[PDB]
């Protein structure tokens, strides 16, 4: 009969740090009638070997706050992405309180709900469980503070052959506040270079290096010659450069004007993908690469862009204008275009009898001296991921964007103690993350680009509720606006 | 080291947009957009590298050079690295190798974003006048000290390192194919749809053991001999450096890295292989960097980015997050006589002036 | 400082991403600095 906590939502902007608190109201049903049950595709029909899965569904629910808009208002994101060149989550604080158990009775033909029972909760700080948070799943805390959300069920997967199990597979039987200190991770770079990697040169003075300009005097026979010239402002493609753009794994180019696209179903046949143990997984979103060459705004990589969807968009085969296809143009200066080849290489030795032949490079790994920009984080996009535990990794930052970590925030598992009896519980949830910032020091003379609301007169305000009370986010807000030298 | 330098007046003390459109912009690969500033800069970046104001007047038909004791010289270093960094591209303008020479200080310019010869909204214009700087008359001097960040020793002395193949050009012209393959047959990397030559490219031996004559088309830095012409000079007018020292741990520049199986053998299908024309990094590779030459650059600036691998620059030397800072310099404009009646327009009439001194 | 708790995003002064011959608030090919438009001071909002 005495409340166990208060309501905390606000943002304290202090110096180089930010503190964003968010509180929501939640409801936890009873999953699987309190039973751990095996699951596999054989329950769902098992059409393909690429879709094979094996694992267990558990009665426990878990809390997923891993998306940005949980912690940031549309205003707190604007204030952040305009004035800062970087941020990262120093600390985490999570409080869970005001537990209310409601038992349901069906008497005659009506259902009456009355108070009662315990609710078990624990966190895995030894990481002995699977980690299902960083996979971009649903069930994260709602953006708009007045929403009430339902806790997603916890279930996991493990080794499989077809739908059958194997001798090495594992079965885990899982049988309030805490604080968390993130491990050190590099600042997210929010900015779009004002230079391009090939144009770093001084346009006036010329290099002391030479290149081979002419291999023949002119049209005729036995005209072979070698003439060298200076690399300078006149021809800027051949100048000697120290650094070369980041790696690429090519994607197909799909055009939002449906007539441009080839008239055939190439969605899975033409999609780039990587094969693991016989199961072909689509490459999504893949390495960080710009979507389209400058001035091309109707072409997007087929599987390389985080594709959200608008409020009220169905699950299956929704129209093109019911989804929001993010733009990664910001990184075209240091990164190769996603729909383009990385370059060319020589395929043979020229000689008197053989012409010089070259061929395109459709994918390139890391080479010494490469630089690249990682993928941008979005208002709706994920925050952190768990770097899988392996003997090796390279540049662990996750491919969907955000902060790769080897000890991410622990999972929080919660269930209703079986008493069976129809039962559910409800309460409050608060999560407080202390963000650290990197201020914008630039000397640029002319004004930047900023994220601004638009002035056309309209019926609804963006990022606000309409006459039905339905909160809707009109467009993705990714953060690169401020510019910085290369 | 010490040298004697001379600083003219660039651009009539003006910032001026420059782009390919002033040069016509023939090819899309050579497109550029940027600015050109009156400031000059000191560049000592090459290995072999290791205040007096004057005015000019036209009197009758002859030009008389006089001292000017009251004029000043503005100099500043960028130690926060807020300007574009032009010292890393191996431009000319370095201190001369032989101290008895007197050198001219190159003009400062910087390039930024573009589409074609125009400028996109993201492109940013920097005004060097907006940095603080020290003003020096004929008795004042300027100095500062720098501290290099820790960089690995330069090495002068499991599977081999990566390769990106270069076309093979032979010094004897009879051997070379009788066609124009200078640009068409060259190894390139494409960025934003502008094909850019791969030069020098990763560190790779230039030729197999025993075949000294052949050289990679863009693999090795080429240095001109004393007095060599800017355009179309023969091969004996240039020095072509060879990397053959590193042939032990690195693949030859003109060779394929190796072979990989392209299919599964069976009773009905033969075992097939295919050539590896380029190989990225794999676990276990070891490789050598490119050697530095007495005429070669020392350092480069590692572009500020989320990530990079083995940042040591391709041309040579020591890659550094924070390199030695730029040093910018200009001669403060002294306006001529203004008209006795007020006119809001800025004064375009200045005294012809230059300065000289030591480094 | 603005302490406003307004939920939706403010209007901000932004330089439109544009493609043009010259860069706004910067020099042209002859070295003439130019200011394209008058700039107001009123963008953020507050309750009356």
């Amino acid at each position, epitope marked *: 009969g005495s409340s166990s906590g208060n309501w905390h939502c606000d943002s304290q902007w202090l110096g180089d740090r930010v503190i964003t608190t968010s509180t929501r109201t939640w409801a936890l049903p009873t999953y699987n009638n309190h039973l751990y049950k095996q699951i596999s595709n054989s329950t769902s029909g098992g059409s393909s070997n690429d879709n094979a899965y094996f694992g267990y569904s558990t009665p426990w629910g878990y809390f997923d706050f891993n998306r940005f808009h949980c912690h940031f208002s549309p205003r707190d994101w604007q204030r952040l992405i305009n004035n800062n060149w970087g941020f990262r989550p120093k600390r985490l604080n999570f409080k869970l309180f005001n537990i209310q158990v409601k038992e349901v009775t069906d008497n005659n033909g009506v259902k009456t709900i009355a108070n009662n029972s315990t609710v078990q909760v624990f966190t895995d700080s030894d990481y002995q469980l699977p980690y299902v948070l960083g996979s971009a799943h649903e069930g994260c805390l709602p953006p708009f503070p007045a929403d009430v959300f339902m806790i997603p069920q916890y279930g996991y997967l493990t080794l499989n052959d077809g739908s059958q199990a194997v001798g090495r597979s594992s079965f885990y039987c899982l049988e309030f506040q805490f604080s968390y200190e993130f491990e050190n991770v590099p600042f997210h770079s929010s900015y779009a270079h004002s230079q391009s990697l090939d144009r770093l040169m001084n346009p006036l003075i010329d290099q002391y290096l030479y290149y081979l300009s002419k291999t023949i005097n002119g049209s005729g026979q036995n005209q072979q010659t070698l003439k060298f010239s200076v690399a300078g402002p006149s021809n800027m493609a051949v100048q000697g450069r120290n650094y070369i753009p980041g790696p690429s794994y090519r994607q197909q180019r799909v055009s939002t004007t449906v007539t441009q696209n080839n008239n055939s179903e190439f969605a899975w046949p033409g999609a780039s993908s990587w094969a693991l143990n016989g199961r072909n997984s689509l490459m999504n979103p893949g390495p960080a690469m710009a979507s389209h060459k400058e001035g091309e705004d109707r072409f997007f990589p087929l599987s390389g862009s985080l594709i959200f969807g608008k409020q009220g968009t169905g699950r299956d085969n929704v129209d093109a204008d019911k989804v929001m296809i993010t*733009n990664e143009e910001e990184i075209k200066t240091t990164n190769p275009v996603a729909t383009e080849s990385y370059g060319q290489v020589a395929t043979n030795h020229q000689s008197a009898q053989a012409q010089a032949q070259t061929g395109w490079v459709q994918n390139q790994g890391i080479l010494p001296g490469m630089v690249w920009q990682d993928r941008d984080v979005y208002l709706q996009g994920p925050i952190w991921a768990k770097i899988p535990h392996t003997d090796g990794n390279f540049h662990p930052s996750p491919l969907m964007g955000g902060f790769g970590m080897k000890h991410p925030p622990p999972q929080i598992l919660i269930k209703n103690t079986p008493v069976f009896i129809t039962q559910y519980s409800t309460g409050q949830v608060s999560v407080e993350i202390e963000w650290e910032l990197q201020k914008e020091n630039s000397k640029r003379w002319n004004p930047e680009i900023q994220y601004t609301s638009n002035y056309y*007169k*309209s019926n609804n305000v963006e990022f606000a509720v309409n006459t039905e009370g339905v909160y809707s986010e009109p467009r993705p807000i990714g953060t690169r606006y401020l510019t910085r030298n290369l | 080291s010490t040298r004697t330098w001379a600083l003219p007046t660039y651009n009539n003390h003006l910032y001026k947009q420059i782009s390919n459109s002033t040069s016509g912009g023939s090819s899309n690969d050579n497109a550029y957009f940027g600015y050109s500033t009156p400031w000059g800069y000191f560049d000592f970046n090459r290995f072999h590298c290791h205040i007096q104001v004057k005015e000019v007047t036209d009197n009758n038909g002859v030009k008389t050079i006089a001292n000017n004791l009251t004029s000043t010289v503005q100099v500043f270093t960028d130690s926060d690295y807020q300007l574009p960094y032009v010292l890393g591209s191996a431009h000319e303008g370095c201190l001369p190798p032989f101290p008895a020479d007197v050198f001219m200080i190159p003009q400062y310019g910087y390039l930024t974003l573009n589409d074609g010869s125009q400028a996109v909204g993201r492109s940013s214009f920097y005004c060097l006048e907006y940095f603080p700087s020290q003003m020096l008359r004929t008795g004042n001097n300027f100095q500062f000290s720098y501290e290099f960040e820790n960089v690995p020793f330069h090495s002068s002395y499991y599977i081999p390192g990566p390769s990106y193949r270069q076309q093979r050009v032979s010094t004897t012209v009879t051997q070379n194919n009788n066609s124009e393959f200078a640009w068409p047959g060259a190894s390139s990397w494409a960025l934003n749809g502008r094909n850019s030559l791969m030069n020098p490219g990763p560190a790779m031996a230039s030729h197999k053991e025993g075949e000294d004559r052949f050289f990679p088309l863009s693999g090795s830095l080429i240095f001109g001999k004393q007095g060599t012409g800017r355009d179309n000079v023969d091969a004996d007018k240039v020095m072509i450096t060879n990397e053959e020292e590193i042939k032990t741990t690195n693949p030859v520049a003109t060779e394929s890295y190796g072979q990989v199986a392209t299919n599964h053998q069976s009773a009905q299908a033969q075992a097939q292989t295919g050539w590896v024309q380029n190989q990225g990094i794999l676990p276990g590779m070891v490789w050598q960097d490119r050697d530095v030459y007495l005429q070669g650059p020392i350092w480069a600036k590692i572009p500020h980015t989320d990530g990079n691998f083995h940042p040591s620059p391709l041309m040579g030397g020591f890659g550094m997050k924070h390199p030695p800072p730029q040093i910018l310099i200009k001669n403060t404009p002294v306006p001529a006589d203004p008209p006795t009646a007020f006119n809001k327009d800025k004064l375009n009439s200045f005294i012809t002036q230059y300065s000289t001194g030591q480094v | 400082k603005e302490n406003s708790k307004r939920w939706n995003p403010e209007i901000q002064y932004t330089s439109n991403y544009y493609k043009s011959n010259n860069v706004e608030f910067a020099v042209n090919t002859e070295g003439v600095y130019s200011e394209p438009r008058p700039i107001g001071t009123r963008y953020l909002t507050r309750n009356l």
Partner: antibody, heavy 128, light 109 residues
Framework: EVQLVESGGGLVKPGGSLRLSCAAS????????MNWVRQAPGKGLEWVSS????????DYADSVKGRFTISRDTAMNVLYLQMDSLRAEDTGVYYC??????????????????????WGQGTTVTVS | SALTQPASVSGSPGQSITISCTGT?????????VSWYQHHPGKAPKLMIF???NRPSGVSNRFSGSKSGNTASLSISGLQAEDEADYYC??????????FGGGTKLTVL
């Protein structure tokens, strides 16, 4: 004050060719899409062709496709519609409009269409 | 063509008026685009409505719009003699073309 003035309309026998120019003033001409529409005598507005911001995408109404070529010089802001192999249906009043986008920095690749923003008074092309 | 819009509508000063154009298949109002134009004879046409109902800076509040199902409609209120013009509706299409209705001449009495 943003203004677009059409020019070059006139009288040309069928089968002839007419070039129409649109002189843009007051705004950045290379940052916007630009497109031509046509009003036949005693009829409603009809659309002819279009040209994108970076000139990558040129579009044509089904009827005039192949007989017209739209292009902009861009040295000095102007727009050009090359009318070749004119018919009797090409009589009308040609307008020069620019699709209006409030923010030129796209946040998403598929952007909802907002329609034309600035129009010219149009020139009359007549065939006999 | 492709957008059916009535030949002419008329109203007395002060009275509201609903002009409505209909379209076929999916492409009608693809993305958000259903746009209403005001064409006075001999002068430049004006974009009264951009989007289903959003209206630009220049337009007066009197003009409004909505799209119900397959039908979009322009609603003029507080009618005046200066509102007499031709009114066209347009919608972007799937091939990146725009499609204008035949248009309604509104004669205020």
């Amino acid at each position: 004050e943003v203004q677009l003035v059409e020019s070059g309309g006139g009288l040309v026998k069928p089968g002839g060719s007419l070039r129409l120019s649109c002189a843009a003033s007051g705004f950045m001409f290379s940052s916007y899409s630009m497109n031509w529409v046509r009003q036949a005598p005693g009829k409603g507005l009809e659309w002819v062709s279009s040209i994108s911001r970076s000139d990558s995408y040129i579009d044509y109404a089904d009827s005039v496709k192949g007989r017209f070529t739209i292009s902009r010089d861009t040295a000095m802001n102007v727009l050009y519609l090359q009318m070749d192999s004119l018919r009797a249906e090409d009589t009308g009043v040609y307008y020069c409009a620019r699709t209006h986008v409030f923010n030129m920095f796209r946040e998403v690749i598929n952007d909802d269409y907002y329609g034309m923003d600035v129009w010219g008074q149009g020139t009359t092309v007549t065939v006999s | 063509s492709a957008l059916t819009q009535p030949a002419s509508v008329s109203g007395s000063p002060g009275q509201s008026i609903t002009i409505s154009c209909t379209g076929t298949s999916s492409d009608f109002g693809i993305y958000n685009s259903v746009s209403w134009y005001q064409h006075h004879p001999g002068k430049a046409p004006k974009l009264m409505i951009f989007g289903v109902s959003n209206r630009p800076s220049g337009v007066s509040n009197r003009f409004s719009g909505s799209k119900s199902g397959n039908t979009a409609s322009l609603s003029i209120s507080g009618l005046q003699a200066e509102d007499e013009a031709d009114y066209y509706c347009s919608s972007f299409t799937a091939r990146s073309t725009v499609v204008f209705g035949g248009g309604t001449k509104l004669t205020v009495l």
